[PDB]
Design a protein around this ligand. Structure first.
Ligand SMILES: Nc1ncnc2c1ncn2[C@@H]1O[C@H](COP(=O)(O)OP(=O)(O)NP(=O)(O)O)[C@@H](O)[C@H]1O
Ligand SMILES: [Mg+2]
Length: 283
């Protein structure tokens, strides 16, 4: 309507120019979008993508333009991530997520390519296509799960009741991927995803996860010992290992929350988070 289509980016996404401010934006063109406009229009947090406008003739959602995303950074061999880089990305991720959870919203699709980065190193959660108020019902056969590699074990065992844990597990997978620069648990099937979770983190005992055997799709895997976190992340300090451990607890009620994650010593310890403007950018 009042936007000129500049470059194509990848539903269909275009770069554009707002003729009011001459501001550069991203326009996403196509009931998935109804629920999205509802939440996103009224939210406002630096680390949550802003919905600037919408119009219907199909639906077009107008978003802040973000020059890159975490997956691009992770896959870019010319960039080396320092401990301070990783700390900055996690802090922005968790502050965004803490906001959402305080507003009783689950993202439900956290993965590196949904953490967008602007030219000033501001990270923003995006793609609220699966986002849900905590108390909304979970559909029978149209149930929307994150891509498998970021997916919490309770979801892989068919949980219909879940909460904050699904996002926090994903956040642990994103952290692991920042550290390893490859996906942490790349399952090739939903069963193989559980296999990989268990042979890496151990097959849960009933005291680690009391209610596991009563999940709708529970089945008996072999007992795997797991691998010590300090062996997997050989460059991570004890403070980072404690955060990673908290994010991958099997019991979704024991798993660390965004708020608890942000209060951990990791975030107050040296080295500090990289200022956004010094974060490494694809050249
Ligand atoms: N706000 C934005 N600013 C700049 N580029 C963007 C923005 N949002 C999306 N893009 C780009 O457009 C592409 C469209 O991909 P997209 O379809 O959003 O991801 P997807 O996970 O494959 N499907 P979807 O469910 O639509 O997210 C992305 O990979 C980005 O490179
Ligand atoms: Mg996406």
């Amino acid at each position: 309507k009042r936007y000129e289509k500049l470059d194509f980016l990848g539903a269909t996404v275009y770069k554009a120019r707002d003729k009011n401010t001459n501001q550069i934006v991203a326009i996403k063109k196509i009931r998935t979008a109804l629920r999205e406009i509802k939440l996103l229009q009224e939210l406002s947090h630096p680390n949550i993508i802003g919905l600037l406008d919408a119009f219907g003739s199909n639906i077009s959602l107008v978003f802040d333009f973000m020059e890159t995303d975490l997956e691009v950074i992770i896959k870019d061999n010319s960039l080396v991530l320092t401990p301070s880089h990783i700390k900055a990305y996690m802090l922005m991720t968790l502050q965004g997520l803490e906001y959402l959870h305080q507003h009783r919203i689950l993202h439900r699709d956290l993965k590196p390519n949904n953490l967008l980065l602007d030219e000033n190193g501001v990270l923003k959660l995006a793609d609220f296509g699966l986002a849900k108020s905590f108390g909304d019902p979970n559909r029978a056969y149209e149930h929307q799960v994150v891509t498998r590699w970021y997916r919490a074990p309770e979801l892989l065992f068919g949980a219909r009741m879940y909460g904050v844990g699904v996002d926090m597990w994903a956040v642990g997978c994103i952290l692991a991927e920042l550290l390893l620069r490859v996906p942490f648990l790349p399952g090739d099937s939903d069963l193989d995803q559980l296999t990989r979770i268990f042979e890496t983190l151990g097959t849960p005992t009933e005291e680690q996860w009391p209610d596991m055997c009563s999940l709708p799709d529970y089945v008996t895997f072999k007992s795997f010992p797991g691998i010590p976190l300090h062996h997997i992340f050989s460059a991570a300090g004890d403070d980072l290992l404690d955060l990673i451990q908290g994010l991958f607890l099997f019991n979704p009620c024991a798993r660390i929350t965004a708020t608890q994650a942000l209060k951990m010593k990791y975030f107050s310890n040296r080295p500090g988070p990289t200022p956004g403007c010094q974060l490494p950018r694809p050249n």
